């Protein structure tokens, strides 16, 4: 069907199984002193994390104070200059002998592809943390400073009123 | 189109009667019993007329073929189109007749003719019983 | 190879986010009638803490199951209103998820 069937073990665990789970896990721990499914109550025991700390799904694999970059910068600049130079040479190829133009085209793309690699090491979450950091920091400083400004102006008004009433005495 | 027009007007008046009985039941105070009986009987006999007239003109309704308008936009009104398109019964009625058939559960044919003869015999017996005593 | 129970339970949890899946599951009588399914739903609650929460793909179901948790004391009735209510309350629920995680 369109919707896959519920998992099979879901139907094994009734309320009685839930209430008898404590004694079952106590007995299992006492006896113990891929997990084989010898009893229907085994699944409620929390599954163990794989030792390799890896998870595979759909053909793809998955697994501290914030809780020479100049070399990369100059590499990027020289790569951009070489990319412009190669673009000029490739368009010249198109001009004179376009029949073999593709011979350079993908080459240029490789440099562009390398640029993407040069982005990968530069990857930005810390920079986003920084920018959010300063925006809420400056917002709270603005709120604070307007607080002492308003309380100070109220105090100044109170002192002026006190002087006015003392003069009228 | 004439048959569907008559179906339209009769179903419209039936829906009007339903709206009526609705807005006189929605009141916090229940009216007199007799008014409720009158409304019930009128609306229910009207439903009978609806059923009979729908029975009469099945051929005209069947002959008609449903097709969306060229001017009607389905991109924006696909939800509205699907709302009227769907026809599956409400589930509770479904398991209702499923349990009904479960409870009910050449042999069948001869039971059928035995039911025929019981029906005819009972009809004749009650005709005789009515004729036995003068009711006028 | 045969996937482990981790993979199937995680995929079930992430598929619970679909409104169509929830509507289909609640359409059948015996799914809600059987206490086994709700027992499994309450068992699934323990994935809201790390490091399990680091393995999720769509955080919305995190509330949905919790919303489904509410369904055991709110009633089936309300199944029809489920798509409308999720569409209407998507903004504030996404905001509260962001507050729970992004802050």
């Amino acid at each position: 069907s369109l919707y896959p069937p519920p998992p099979p073990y879901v139907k094994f665990f009734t309320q009685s199984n839930l209430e008898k789970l404590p004694k079952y896990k106590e007995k299992k721990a006492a006896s113990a002193k891929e997990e084989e499914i010898t009893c229907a109550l085994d699944y409620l025991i929390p599954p163990p994390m794989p030792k390799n700390q890896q998870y595979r799904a759909f053909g793809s694999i998955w697994q501290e104070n914030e809780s020479n970059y100049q070399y990369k910068i100059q590499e990027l600049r020289k790569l951009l200059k070489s990319l412009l130079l190669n673009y000029l040479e490739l368009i010249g190829v198109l001009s004179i002998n376009p029949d073999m133009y593709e011979r350079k085209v993908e080459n240029i793309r490789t440099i562009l592809v390398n640029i993407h690699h040069l982005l990968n090491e530069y990857r930005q979450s810390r920079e986003s943390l920084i920018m959010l950091l300063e925006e809420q920091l400056e917002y709270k400083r603005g709120e604070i400073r307007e607080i002492e400004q308003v309380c100070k102006q109220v105090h100044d008004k109170l002192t002026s009123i006190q002087d006015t009433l003392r003069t009228g005495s | 189109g004439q048959a569907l027009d008559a179906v339209r007007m009769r179903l419209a008046q039936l829906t009007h009667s339903l709206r009526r009985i609705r807005d006189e039941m929605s009141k916090a105070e229940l009216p007199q019993w007799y008014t409720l009986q009158s409304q019930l009987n009128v609306t229910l006999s009207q439903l009978v007329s609806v059923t009979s007239t729908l029975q009469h003109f099945q051929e005209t309704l069947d002959s008609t073929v449903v097709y969306p308008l060229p001017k009607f936009p389905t991109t924006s009104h696909e939800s509205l189109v699907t709302t009227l398109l769907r026809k599956k019964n409400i589930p509770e009625v479904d398991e209702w007749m499923k349990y009904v058939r479960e409870t009910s559960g050449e042999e069948i044919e001869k039971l059928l003719q035995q039911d025929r003869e019981i029906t005819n015999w009972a009809r004749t017996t009650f005709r005789n019983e009515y004729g036995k005593h003068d009711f006028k | 190879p045969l996937p482990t129970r981790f993979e199937v339970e995680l995929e079930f949890i992430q598929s619970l986010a679909n409104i169509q899946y929830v509507t289909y599951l609640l359409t059948q009588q015996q799914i809600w009638k059987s206490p086994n399914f709700k027992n499994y739903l309450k068992y699934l609650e323990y994935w809201c803490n790390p490091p399990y929460s680091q393995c999720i793909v769509y955080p919305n179901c995190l509330f949905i199951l919790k919303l489904l948790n509410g369904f055991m004391e709110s009633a089936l009735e309300g199944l029809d209103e489920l798509p409308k209510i999720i569409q209407l309350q998507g903004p504030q629920w996404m905001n509260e998820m962001v507050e729970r995680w992004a802050n």
Binding site: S1, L2 | K88, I90 | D80, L82
Partner: peptide, 25 residues
């Protein structure tokens, strides 16, 4: 003329009961 038109009694909240099953290829 027409004494009164009918009030709109649309029920979009109705969930419908369309059976879906031939999705797998």
């Amino acid at each position: 003329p027409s004494y009164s038109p009918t009030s709109p009694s649309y029920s979009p909240t109705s969930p419908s009961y369309s059976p879906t099953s031939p999705s797998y290829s």
